[PDB]
C-alpha cells in the first residue's frame, strides 16, 4: 500500500527536510496534503504521472518530484514554525477516485533543539482496593516531560503487544499550557483480571517510542542527548 518515511520528525527553524512517499500499486496519481488542527486536509502538490507535477491549495515552501511511478518525495526547503503539521501522502490508480493514504508524517518545527526532551516513563501498580471491590486490576503508564509530542505508547504482556483492555489518552497534556514549547505528559491504562495480575510470572511493560534528535545533531547540554529511543517501564504480577 502507501508507505511514508519518517513517521515523525523534529526540525530547527531553517533546516530542510525530505518526506518519502512510496506506493508499489502502480498507481499513477499521487498527492501530498497537510492536516492542521481545525483545518482538515489541504492539498500541497500533486502528480498525474511520472515527469508531471502540479500545485495545489498551499504549495508555498514545498517542492516535489515525480521521476518514477513509485515515489513522490516532498521536500521542505526551509522549516518555519507554521509548517508544524501532519503530512499525508495519498494515491489512486489514476486512469472512481478512492484515495488510499499513507500513515502520515508528523513534523514539529522548533526555534531551539535544546527544547527536545525524552519521556520519563513509570508504571503504577493496581490498587488493592480496586482488586477487592471489582475483581479487576488497572495498571497505569505515565510518560512525562517529553517534547516534541512525538511518541507511540504500547503495552506488552508476556512479551506480546496487547490492545484489549487498554486505553491511552488521545492527546498529551501540556505540562505548562501557557508556554509555547511546553513539555508533554501522556497516560495509559491497562486493565486485567485480579487473578491475572496476581500471578507473579506475568509481566507487564509499557513501551514509549520517542522520536527526537539523531546521531549528528550537536549536543552540549548537561543531560544525555535526546535521541530517538525507546523508554519503557515494567511491573511483574504479585500475589500482593
Amino acid at each position: 500500500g502507501v508507505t511514508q518515511t519518517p513517521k515523525f520528525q523534529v526540525l530547527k527553524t531553517g533546516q530542510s527536510m525530505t518526506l518519502q512517499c512510496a506506493q508499489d500499486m502502480n498507481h499513477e496519481y499521487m498527492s501530498w496534503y497537510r492536516q492542521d488542527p481545525g483545518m482538515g486536509l489541504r492539498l500541497i502538490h500533486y502528480s498525474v504521472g511520472a515527469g508531471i507535477t502540479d500545485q495545489g491549495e498551499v504549495p508555498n515552501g514545498y517542492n516535489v518530484s515525480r521521476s518514477t511511478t513509485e515515489d513522490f518525495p516532498l521536500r521542505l526547503l526551509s522549516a518555519a514554525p507554521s509548517q508544524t503539521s501532519v503530512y499525508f501522502c495519498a494515491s489512486r490508480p489514476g486512469l472512481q477516485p478512492e484515495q488510499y493514504f499513507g500513515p502520515g508524517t508528523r513534523l514539529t518545527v522548533t526555534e531551539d533543539l535544546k527544547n527536545v526532551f525524552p519521556p520519563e516513563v513509570a508504571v503504577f501498580e493496581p490498587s488493592e482496593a480496586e482488586i477487592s471491590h471489582t475483581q479487576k486490576a488497572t495498571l497505569v503508564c505515565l510518560a512525562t516531560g517529553f517534547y516534541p509530542d512525538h511518541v507511540e505508547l504500547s503495552w506488552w504482556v508476556n512479551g506480546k503487544e496487547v490492545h484489549s483492555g487498554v486505553c491511552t489518552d488521545p492527546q498529551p497534556l501540556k505540562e505548562q499550557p501557557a508556554l509555547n514549547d511546553s513539555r508533554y505528559a501522556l497516560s495509559s491504562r491497562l486493565r486485567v483480571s485480579a487473578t491475572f495480575w496476581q500471578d507473579p510470572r506475568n509481566h507487564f511493560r509499557c513501551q514509549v517510542q520517542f522520536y527526537g534528535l539523531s546521531e549528528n545533531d550537536e549536543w552540549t547540554q548537561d543531560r544525555a542527548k535526546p535521541v530517538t529511543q525507546i523508554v519503557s517501564a515494567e511491573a511483574w504480577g504479585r500475589a500482593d
Binding site: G40, L41, A122, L139, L142, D169, P170, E175
Partner: protein
C-alpha cells in the same frame, strides 16, 4: 467550499451519529466520507454519486443535490466508531471539509464510581489517582491548580469480560497531595 457541522458530537451508544456537509459548487459530481481514528490516516468509508440513500453496514450516506448537502448517519453507534469523519467533494481533485469528531459514549451497565491511588512499581514514593467505573453522564472537570494534572476520560474495553469502563487519571508533584483533592 466544503463545510461540516461543528464537533465534537457526543452520541450515546446505540443512537445515531449524524453528520453533514455542505458544498458551494452545485456542479460537483462525486461525494465521499472518510473515517479518521485519532493519530491515524483517513480511510474511505462511503462514496455517493446520485441523489438519495446509499447503505453499507451501519452507514447510510445521503445526497441532496437540490439542497447541496451530503450527510452520513452511523446507526447503532458503538464506542469503536469514535473518530473524526471528513466530507470530501470532487470538482477528480478532492476538496476536504474540516471534519467532525464523533465520541460514542459507552452504556455503563453497572457503574461503581471510585477513586483509587496507585503506586509506582519502582520507587514506591510516587503515585497517581485513578477515577474509574463512573457512568458516561459523569463530568470530569479540569484541576483548580497548575501543579495537578487531570486527563480527559478514556473508555477501555476488556473483551475478555465483555466489559467496558470509563476512567481518568490525575497526578501531581506537590507532596501531601491526596487523591481526595484531585477530582473536583
Amino acid at each position: 467550499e466544503v463545510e461540516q457541522n461543528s464537533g465534537p458530537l457526543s452520541v450515546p451508544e446505540g443512537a445515531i451519529a449524524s453528520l453533514n456537509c455542505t458544498y458551494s459548487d452545485r456542479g460537483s459530481q462525486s461525494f465521499f466520507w472518510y473515517r479518521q481514528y485519532s493519530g491515524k490516516s483517513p480511510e474511505l468509508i462511503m462514496s455517493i454519486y446520485s441523489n438519495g440513500d446509499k447503505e453499507d453496514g451501519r452507514f447510510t450516506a445521503q445526497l441532496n443535490k437540490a439542497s447541496q448537502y451530503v450527510s452520513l448517519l452511523i446507526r447503532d453507534s458503538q464506542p469503536s466508531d469514535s473518530a473524526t469523519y471528513l466530507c470530501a467533494v470532487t470538482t477528480g481533485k478532492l476538496q476536504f471539509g474540516a471534519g467532525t469528531q464523533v465520541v460514542v459514549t459507552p452504556d455503563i451497565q453497572n457503574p461503581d464510581p471510585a477513586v483509587y491511588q496507585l503506586r509506582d512499581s519502582k520507587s514506591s514514593d510516587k503515585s497517581v489517582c485513578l477515577f474509574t467505573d463512573f457512568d458516561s453522564q459523569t463530568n470530569v472537570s479540569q484541576s483548580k491548580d497548575s501543579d495537578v494534572y487531570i486527563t480527559d476520560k478514556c473508555v477501555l474495553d476488556m473483551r475478555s469480560m465483555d466489559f467496558k469502563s470509563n476512567s481518568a487519571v490525575a497526578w501531581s508533584n506537590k507532596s501531601d497531595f491526596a487523591c481526595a483533592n484531585a477530582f473536583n
